[PDB]
Ligand binder design. Structure first.
Ligand SMILES: O=c1c(O)c(-c2ccc(O)cc2)oc2cc(O)cc(O)c12
Length: 238
């Protein structure tokens, strides 16, 4: 992700077919002549989309120009969580399914996977970062404590950020329970809170290279959100 100073980021299109699909998703959702109520509501939960972008001298080099969801924070604490039971899409080959399931074989059981976090620590004036192997190591026994780490500034558990995250996720969950036209595979939620309040918490959906038309509720996504809500809720009892 390329963080530009004017409060936006540039996300480079993934190689085909993934980048092109993510481009088309943003184009469908943010079509100026769109009056589909489902899609207009979905806009609230995504980064604001500014269209395709490429460098002036390089029309070959394709990016999405997107809102920087961390812009309004001073010391943003950021967690990326992949949502759903299946990280592979409805047209994946046998090998691709195996590739995806092997990355994290607990996806069906847990319904979400922590892709990373960056946590500001007050008393050291520094960030602790966790990479993809952190989340991939978490089991049903360790997921609650694994998620909890995101909300530890060193001195207190930020239950305010936990509660606000639940409240923001619940609105996304409500959107999913009132649409039967899109199914989302390998998509994520980006959580941001202020590390330096309730207060600023941001929760946005990202990563749309495997969103497909559907005739049904996205059951895997709903399962993941519900399980994530339940884990966060249990952290409020700590
Ligand atoms: O706005 C965005 C953002 O700030 C970040 C980010 C910033 C710092 C990190 O350490 C990790 C991610 O990722 C993104 C990924 C997207 O697909 C879309 C976005 O709009 C953002």
């Amino acid at each position: 992700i390329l963080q530009h100073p004017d409060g936006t980021v540039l996300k480079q299109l993934q190689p085909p077919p993934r980048g092109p699909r993510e481009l088309e998703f943003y184009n469908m959702v943010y079509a100026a002549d769109c009056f589909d109520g489902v899609l207009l509501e979905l806009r609230k939960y995504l980064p604001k989309y500014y269209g395709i972008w490429s460098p002036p001298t390089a029309p070959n080099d394709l990016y999405l120009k997107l809102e920087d969801v961390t812009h309004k924070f001073n010391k943003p604490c950021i967690m990326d969580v992949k949502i759903g039971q299946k990280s592979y899409d409805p047209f994946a080959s046998s090998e691709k399914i195996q590739q995806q399931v092997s990355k994290y074989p607990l996806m069906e059981e847990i319904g979400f996977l922590v892709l990373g976090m960056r946590v500001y620590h007050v008393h050291s004036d520094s960030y602790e970062t966790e990479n993809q192997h952190y989340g991939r190591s978490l089991t049903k026994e360790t997921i609650k404590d694994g998620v909890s780490r995101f909300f530890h500034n060193g001195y207190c558990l930020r239950k305010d950020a936990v509660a606000a995250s639940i409240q923001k996720i619940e609105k996304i969950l409500q959107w999913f329970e009132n649409q039967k036209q899109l199914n989302f595979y390998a998509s994520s939620l980006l959580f941001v809170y202020e590390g330096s309040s309730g207060g600023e918490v941001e929760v946005r959906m990202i990563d749309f290279a495997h969103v497909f038309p559907s005739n049904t509720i996205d059951e895997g996504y709903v399962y993941g959100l519900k399980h994530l809500i339940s884990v966060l809720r249990s952290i409020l009892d700590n």
